[PDB]
């Protein structure tokens, strides 16, 4: 709010991916590492876009404070931003429900459907109620 500089360098757009990607460094005098929730709006008040397309990550801070630096990008459309995007960076600020069963149980269900062959209702209910 008082003394933070958000420079950019090495900006390249591509309408291939319909994104606008660049390198961002964050220079602060003596404060802490400012969060993404304070930085991903400081491009939104400068690129004039909605801050549901600006995705920032990768902030690694130098030895001695001052300049931390990282990578950021801007999709063209939130409709685009949910098509060509992996779900892990998409869900760092809340946009997707990702919690299935942990994979070690889902492995064992697939091999258990494999040992009860063919019967479609016992390829669904191969022990749903016995839990």
């Amino acid at each position: 709010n008082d003394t933070v500089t958000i420079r950019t360098r090495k900006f390249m757009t591509n309408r291939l991916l319909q994104r606008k990607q660049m390198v961002i460094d964050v220079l602060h005098p003596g404060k802490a590492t400012v969060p993404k929730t304070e930085i991903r709006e400081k491009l939104a008040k400068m690129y004039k876009t909605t801050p549901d397309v600006i995705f920032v990550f990768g902030f690694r801070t130098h030895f001695g404070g001052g300049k931390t630096t990282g990578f950021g990008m801007i999709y063209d459309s939130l409709d685009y931003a949910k098509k060509n995007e992996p779900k892990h960076r998409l869900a760092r600020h809340g946009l997707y429900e990702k919690k299935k069963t942990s994979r070690k149980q889902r492995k064992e269900r697939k091999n258990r459907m494999k040992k009860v062959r063919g019967t479609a209702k016992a390829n669904v209910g191969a022990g749903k109620k016995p839990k």
């Binding site: 005098p29 003596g30 030895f63 001695g64 404070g65 001052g66």
Partner: protein, 185 residues
């Protein structure tokens, strides 16, 4: 199987024989003068000074108008000028062999921060590096054996976070102030 680097070599080497008095005590007056932590980082810099003279002995038996002498030699000579051990105009292949080990202990950060008077008492100039105070131009460094170059030799000063470069005092003022306004106003 892995994508690890695997490439890690040693940097110093042990001497040929141990316990001879014209080796360790002539090297004891270097461990104490330029104020180093132990003799492991003297065998480091003597092997650093060795491998340049390992390269420099090939470059003297290489003839003149040689491709790999003038290429490698100039590239060597433009690498130790910028490190400060060798001056500019008399850069040669011949003046590099008369070089001694003193001229690489001078070109550390630990005594180029002493002779700029940023601290006295050369063992203290180790500490105010390691104690997070003294910077290269925008980069504070707590490493005493930083080999400072010559372009960035003038910008050593206190860091802008430092007690001696900024403010926001530590506990030792704040605890001495607290006992006065803790039993009184």
């Amino acid at each position: 199987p892995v994508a690890r680097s695997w490439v890690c070599r040693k940097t110093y080497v042990t001497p040929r024989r141990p316990f001879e008095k014209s080796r360790l005590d002539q090297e004891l007056k270097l461990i104490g003068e330029y104020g180093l932590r132990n003799k492991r980082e003297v065998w480091r810099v003597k092997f650093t000074l060795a491998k340049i003279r390992k390269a420099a002995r090939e470059l003297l038996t290489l003839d003149e108008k040689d491709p790999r002498r003038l290429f490698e030699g100039n590239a060597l000579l433009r690498r130790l000028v910028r490190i400060g051990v060798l001056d500019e105009g008399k850069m040669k292949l011949d003046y590099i062999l008369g070089l001694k080990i003193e001229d690489f202990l001078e070109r550390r950060l630990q005594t180029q921060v002493f002779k700029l008077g940023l601290a006295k008492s050369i063992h203290h100039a180790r500490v105010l590096i390691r104690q997070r105070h003294i910077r290269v131009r925008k980069q504070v460094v707590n490493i005493p054996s930083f080999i400072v170059r010559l372009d960035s030799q003038k910008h050593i000063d206190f860091s802008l976070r430092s007690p001696y470069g900024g403010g926001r005092p530590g506990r030792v003022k704040r605890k001495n102030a607290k006992k006065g306004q803790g039993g009184a106003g």
